[PDB]
Paper text:
Here, we present a high-resolution application of SPA to electron crystallography data, using cryo-EM movies of the prokaryotic, cyclic-nucleotide modulated potassium channel MloK1. Each of the four MloK1 monomers forming the pore has a transmembrane domain (TMD), a voltage sensor domain (VSD), and a soluble cyclic-nucleotide binding domain (CNBD), which lies in the intracellular side. The total molecular weight of the tetramer is 160 kDa. Furthermore, we identified different conformations of MloK1 tetramers within the disordered 2D crystals by means of single-particle classification.
We then applied maximum-likelihood 3D classification in FREALIGN28 to determine conformational variations within the 2D crystals, while imposing C4 symmetry and keeping the alignment parameters for the particles constant. To obtain more insight, the consensus atomic model was flexibly fit into each map of the 3D classes using Normal Mode Analysis and then refined in real space. Compared to model #1, the C-terminal helix in “extended”-like model #3 is rotated by about 4 degrees clockwise when seen from the CNBD side, while in the “compact” model #5 it is rotated by about 3 degrees counter-clockwise. A rotation of the selectivity filter by about the same magnitude also occurs in this trajectory. Finally, the most extended conformers of our ensemble (models #1 and #3) also have the S6 helix crossing bundle and the selectivity filter slightly more constricted (<1 Å) than the most compact ensemble members (models #4, #5, and #6). The eight obtained 3D classes have a slightly lower resolution than the consensus map, likely due to the limited number of particles in each class.
Author numbering:
A (entry chain B), B (entry chain A), C (entry chain D), D (entry chain C): 1 to 355
Write the structure that this text describes.
Amino acid sequence: MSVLPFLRIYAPLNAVLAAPGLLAVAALTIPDMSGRSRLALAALLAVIWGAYLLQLAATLLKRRAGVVRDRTPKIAIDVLAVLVPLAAFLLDGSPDWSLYCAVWLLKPLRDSTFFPVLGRVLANEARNLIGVTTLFGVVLFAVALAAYVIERDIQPEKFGSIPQAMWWAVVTLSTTGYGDTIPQSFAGRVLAGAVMMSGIGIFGLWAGILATGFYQEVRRGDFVRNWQLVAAVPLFQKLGPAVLVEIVRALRARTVPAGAVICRIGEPGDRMFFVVEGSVSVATPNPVELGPGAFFGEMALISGEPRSATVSAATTVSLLSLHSADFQMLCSSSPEIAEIFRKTALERRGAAASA
Amino acid sequence: MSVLPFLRIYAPLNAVLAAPGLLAVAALTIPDMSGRSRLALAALLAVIWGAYLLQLAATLLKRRAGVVRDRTPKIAIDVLAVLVPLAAFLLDGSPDWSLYCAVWLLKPLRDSTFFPVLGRVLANEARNLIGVTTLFGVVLFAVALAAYVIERDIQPEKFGSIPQAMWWAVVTLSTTGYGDTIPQSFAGRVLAGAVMMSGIGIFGLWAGILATGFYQEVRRGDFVRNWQLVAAVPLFQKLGPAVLVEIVRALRARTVPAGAVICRIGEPGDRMFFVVEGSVSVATPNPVELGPGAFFGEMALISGEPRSATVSAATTVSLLSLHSADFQMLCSSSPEIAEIFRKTALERRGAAASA
Amino acid sequence: MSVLPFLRIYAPLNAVLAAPGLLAVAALTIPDMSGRSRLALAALLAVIWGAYLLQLAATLLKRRAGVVRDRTPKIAIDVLAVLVPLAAFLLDGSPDWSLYCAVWLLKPLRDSTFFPVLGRVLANEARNLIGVTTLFGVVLFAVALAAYVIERDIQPEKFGSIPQAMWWAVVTLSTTGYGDTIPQSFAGRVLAGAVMMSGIGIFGLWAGILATGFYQEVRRGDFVRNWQLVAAVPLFQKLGPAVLVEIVRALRARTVPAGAVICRIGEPGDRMFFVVEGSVSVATPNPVELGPGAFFGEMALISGEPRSATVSAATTVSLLSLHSADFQMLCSSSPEIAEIFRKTALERRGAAASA
Amino acid sequence: MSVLPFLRIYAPLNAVLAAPGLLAVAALTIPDMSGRSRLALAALLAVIWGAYLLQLAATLLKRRAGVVRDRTPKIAIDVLAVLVPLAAFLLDGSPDWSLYCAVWLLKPLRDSTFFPVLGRVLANEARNLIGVTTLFGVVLFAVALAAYVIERDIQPEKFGSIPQAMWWAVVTLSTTGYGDTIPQSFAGRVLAGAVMMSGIGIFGLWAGILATGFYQEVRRGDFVRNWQLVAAVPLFQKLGPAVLVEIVRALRARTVPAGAVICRIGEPGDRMFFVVEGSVSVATPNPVELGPGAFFGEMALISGEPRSATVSAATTVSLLSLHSADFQMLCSSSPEIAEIFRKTALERRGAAASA
Ligand SMILES: [K+]
Ligand SMILES: [K+]
């Protein structure tokens, strides 16, 4: 609610081409299809193949930034991105060689930030997951066995065994309800009463395990990335030690590309930003082009008024962002700083028009 | 638990008429129906059409409050509220013109506050949603492909292709369990074991993403709307800076219409209010009609007793509300203020009967 | 994890008899049944009827504690508890009069504390629920309509109308998957992709709305009930104002009946209690029978040792409970109090054996 | 995200053998199977039987650590681990004696820590669960009854009774959607509209009840286990009282086995550890083998640089772990301690190479 995401978050075309790349699978998979478009898209495989292969060697030029790097992840698939189709094309002379479009599916995951954010936490919290997973196996066979006791008599063809009953366990436990093989007797139908009660109690924790400290990591991701952009601000030699741990939990940083809009004049002013790198276009008779290490919005927050200036992203600006309360927290947190923001809320009234 | 919502929250009839408006669709949709009621409700379309159209021009008189406004949202549908049916009536000479009752469905959403509250946050947090959505696409085809490996042989008519297998993917992943095409072999039935385990882990985050900071926004909505009604209270020149950030998280404000009841005498006193605008009917021999900038309940909270007065909403009062603990927090937070509430818990004993 | 619930939480037999009471419904509902047990349980209705009716008049003696009370809830059903069966017995001469066993179902809810805890909060937070409920209606027909566009042609008997399509909406949205009427075409099967994605995003908030501040109320329920049992403790004239708001969030109170065990000797000591009313049996050569306003466990917590005494509930004791950390919080929160607990951890070593 | 789990968390083979043990059930359960492998695995039962029985007596030697112990849980199944199969083998002369493989399923749960963590909390919070469970029974029959009103006429074979309708209740309430018996009329199909709305509101709390304070216990589990490893650190005589309650919520402890890696040189330094027991291999010209009561990473955190030393687990080290922010919290929390970490960030530069 308090950030401006711009400049092509889903940027690199190395990721993009999997989506059209893998829909190219389908038409080969289908009888009664004409040969025209059949092979037209086989080229598209060769495009993407060639396209990453074009990209490939430029990556294999890993002399760029060659000091200390850990690029086993990034490179691992690029190699197989082109070999696996290639080795496939010959030995699998039959059309099923296209089935090695299971390969690019990592290419999104290759340059997928936020995916290592996932695997980072599992190796602290899987301690619970396994005791639950065991418990998930406890309750499976603890319950799955209860049915073979019963309907083996009058449902041999369905419940004439244990693992057939294990099938109806997770289906019945995992919220699903396929609807293939269901009891007829009473006591077995009694047993289902606890199952949904159970699995929804089970998953009530287990899926909760994920979001539990995942959110901590992401709420922590908003600090590790943001203890940066702190000392750059020339004012923050006076902030107390504990002051900062409060604030940075809310301060998310995102970038704006050049040319785009930041805050349009007259829109309801609801936030203020801290510029730390780049430059802006504060639309005034003298454009107050504040570069690295600046801010604006106190003209709008202290007064609670619309924007006093159409700020447009002159350049690639690494922005922070902040809603009022936590800035009211700040002006509450210290009178010493509202003084300059009091002055600045007067200086920028005269320094907007003037220089 | 600590607020009095009254005065027609679901007020404007511009919203109301969609509900009866769109049930008017149905009877036309149905064979073997008599023509009597068939066309009776076609009028009702013309009513609502005419009714908004009656409303319409009064809105197009946008000279009301014409200083600085952003009414592209509000007006966008009102225009189409009446044109789309109208242009429909002629070219679609066949009865299917009524199918342009897809149009009013925004009219609730037109004057739906709390809906922009939704879209506000997605443009900070969709960063995650897409990495998950990709991941949702990862796991779809990563898993959907695994089945065509198998049952293409003995289930051509069902699993004789990939996207047919993609169908059984999300159905099997998204908790649903339709029950149309299900395996027969073992290894494919093995694969389902992880699926529900997965999707319930997937959605265990992804739906959690929504409530995650949504609740922050709404818990923030209770501050942005409520840093108002602060300075109006004549007492709050002495409250510390950080005192307020604690409190306003709990203080929700709602309005009471005139005539209605606020706190009935003798009911178990469980809360106290801060009046800031309007007037009341404190039912006493001298009605202590406290107007803008007042409160009551300390007579009941300090003593923990029932109500000492039937307070009824004399007028349209913009109320705050507060349960004890956070008022006990207050009386704990400062002895200087309990003094006047000590006195007031004596003055209002004598000032209830007297003037 | 830190409380001792005892003394028949599910106590009153006025609640109990619904469960056997309503299973008495069934055998009448069933053909090919013998008349013997058919009417045997019709008596059991008359038992419970007579049993509450026996209870009834003793309740209608509402001279007990007759000062200020709000007993419209409690009495409302008791009246109908016996009239509704009675008026049923005659006019409904056919056996279906037993269908007025829909009546006792409130009798649990009659003396169901924790149920008003539910309805208390909905009248603060249903503001959201309705904007969501509208939104739930938005997305219903916004999506339900999309299908009649398509399969009316080749599925008249199933999708030959709108509300038939509304049926497949919520079924498909609400996680369920019945499996009666499913598409065959592509584009309609495309549409389901967003649905589960939606409804699981929808309910991802909406059910979250419930637990959101419900937990606040219950986490608040642990304070409102527990700002009691504070001043009774003779030591708590020195605790700071803000000290208490920290602590009582964790301190839950429950009662122990007489005779039962409290802490058995030698078990791993993990907590300490504050007695405020009743008496104990501290099993020592001189039983240190501490009555109202006492505590024990610091002998075990400071040393981190097993229990030094088999404490058994001599009487009906209203207990508090506390795990270490928040007592370590206390001994951390003030050195002035650890002094007496230092002394007490010596006095009770000598005062356990001695008097 | 901030811990190193190693040394065989899922260690004891007493747990392990259930998994292969119980898959041994299946092949006996199946007709048309050869007798060869039929009996081969019956031995495997005798293996595990004999294997625990081998383990058994060594456990019955409970003279180890015989001071004060509560081993009724641990021993209860071991006894039946071998008797139940044994008594089964004779009286159940038919092959169904193998059905007493319901017995080992506790053996995981025997030495399952984190399972008592489950049952600990239910006896504080089941107060709610039962009022909900009653409410779950309220809404069951409150709703289940509504259908027999209707479809008993034209669905006797399906809805010709109440409990048959109770079947379609929980199936329809508990998110499942089997798909066996579904209405045809309107008003009954109206009723389902609230059901999913209800049960997803129901379970929206009820499963939430579990994770609610479960997470508290586990977030409390990270303190009770970790008020240990506090005084051992020679520095922590100066930490304030309240300082610690902040920190230990994040500090999780895990063990590393001997030989394994701790922090490899050059990897991106993201955390620092507190050694309290064991020894390391700080790979330097003079290996700075810090034993009980040590730490490292401030060389990497203050500078925000990669690792300055390949630390490998020389021995079984009981490690703590800590990411920056909470160490930045520390260096923020007190200048007095950053002094020695300032010096140490210089001493270990010279004391890494030197001794
Ligand atoms: K389902
Ligand atoms: K189904």
